[PDB]
Assembly symmetry: C2
Homo-oligomer: 293 residues x 2
């Protein structure tokens, strides 16, 4: 039983990290690159990049704790707690050399603490489509002159009483299609089959709850990061952001400039939030080139 | 056939206005005062203030179109379309004299245009707990350092594909309790019995949909008021806002000073959104004193 199709030459496997059984898909040879997905998705969002990267690198794509086929965390869902799991997972496979890190959406939240605290273990960093949790997220408007905003899910998912689980249960496929397409610039890349796969995966009760616990921990992650951010990142970093509807535009690079000394960014026109699927080829190309320099 | 208990000496009745049958509760004698409820509730939110006002006033409390026992509007749900219905209803009972207006929450949205277009018809005005729809609402934050903001429902309710009705159907009783209490400071007044009453009213399918149609017309209402705001209100007005969790605090009066020449404002400590219920004694006293001047 696999929730998503594994590409040729890759292996679906599990590893215990601090008592928590983590699922991942792994292939390739060479220095290690870890790819970390975001909300609504799983390791599978990288399935197009992974065979290309695996020509020059060892590639590992974990499911975040509680999501996909990984067990929920036993400590908690703030960035610092989850980052321990992802760091220790990567160390098992690259204990003698730095590794590269590519992260999308809440993968950023869940990896930034381990990067800033183990800078010598990270060779190069790619961050795409999510603010690092800090005071800036408090400025994002709740409502726009065009209709619903793109960040009101922060409060919906953070709300207590299990509000999001209760309202979305029974309607997981419907809600996820609306959520994805409303943050997408190009909706045609999400077939009905792909949406069925993602919806069945996050509809598992523990995965549905886990998805929102990351947001229930968001303010704790902001407070954690106010102390972490006294140390700027020193490794080579690239940011990617969509330039169309759902994309973060210039905010991604401009925020990262406050955290990183050596940073380059790109904004991809015609693309929204789901860069690996909406703009697979140009994103794949910029990732591979940046990590191969 | 009453969704809520009519107070002693009042009558539940209906008036056809522009093809639309509006429900209302009415009692008392003297100059007319109209009380307009907001989202999540009906005329019944006024049922404690009405017996007191009726000692000196003719009091009418209609259900907004689509909500309570009132038919949906045949024109639409923008502030200027709904305000026609309420102006016409009031003027059937007060054709020869100005009347007083008290509005709560989206009652403000649905009365402001008729007040500015017919200033000689409004003797005194009391607005509580809502922004008048304008560009200020596009700066309300999606997310706060305390947690979920109070205004993210703007985007939730406005979202297309009938997102809100689709998620909330079958869970209307659960959602109303969460929504009401999360916007309250004095939550203990929302007994299960009272929550049952309001939930069975807005859970009527055309009422659940009507509820969100007001938010789907909000951007139109914003654009309508942009023209109308070029003329400031000339009649004595009072604003009330909660000072506690769910209250709008100083925003209510500060925004109203841009719209009204003659305006006094009160912030009530320990009270959130639902002033008639959370803080009946101070609120009723404030409204009665203001209107009797
Ligand atoms: C993952 C999203 C699925 C994570 O929760 C959020 C990360 C990115 C945020 C979503 C994309 C767009 C965000 C920034 C746009 C800039 C300002 C937004 C404010 C108002 C609006 O137009 O939405
Ligand atoms: C009816 C609400 C049930 C209507 O849709 C909205 C009117 C009232 C909203 C209730 C509370 C709003 C309180 C806060 C206003 C203050 C500043 C705006 C930003 C909100 C925030 O949480 O920071």
């Amino acid at each position: 039983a696999e929730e998503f199709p594994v590409p040729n030459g890759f292996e679906s496997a599990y590893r215990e990290v601090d008592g928590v059984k983590l699922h991942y898909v792994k292939g390739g040879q060479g220095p290690l690159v870890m790819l970390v997905h975001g909300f609504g998705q799983t390791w599978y969002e990288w399935h197009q990049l992974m065979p290309e990267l695996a020509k020059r690198f060892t590639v590992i794509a974990p499911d975040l704790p509680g999501l996909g086929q990984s067990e929920p965390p036993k400590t908690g869902y703030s960035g610092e707690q989850v980052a321990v799991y992802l760091h220790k997972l990567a160390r098992q496979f690259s204990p003698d050399r730095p590794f590269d890190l590519v992260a999308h959406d809440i993968g950023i939240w869940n990896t930034y603490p381990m990067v800033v605290k183990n800078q010598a273990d990270i060779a190069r960093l790619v961050y795409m489509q999510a603010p690092i949790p800090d005071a800036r997220i408090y400025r994002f408007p709740a409502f726009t002159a065009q209709g619903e905003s793109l960040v009101w899910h922060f409060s919906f998912f953070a709300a207590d009483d299990r509000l999001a689980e209760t309202l979305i249960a029974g309607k997981e496929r419907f809600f996820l299609e609306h959520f994805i397409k409303s943050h997408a610039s190009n909706t045609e890349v999400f077939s009905e089959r792909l949406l069925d796969l993602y919806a069945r995966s996050y509809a598992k009760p523990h995965s549905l709850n886990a998805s929102f616990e990351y947001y229930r921990a968001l303010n704790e992650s902001v407070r954690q990061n106010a102390e972490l951010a006294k140390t700027r990142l020193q490794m080579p970093t690239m940011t990617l952001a969509g330039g169309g509807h759902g994309g973060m535009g210039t905010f991604q690079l401009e925020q990262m400039k406050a955290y990183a000394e050596d940073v380059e960014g790109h904004v991809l026109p015609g693309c929204g939030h789901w860069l690996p699927e909406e703009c697979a080829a140009p994103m794949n190309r910029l990732v591979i080139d940046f990590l191969s320099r």
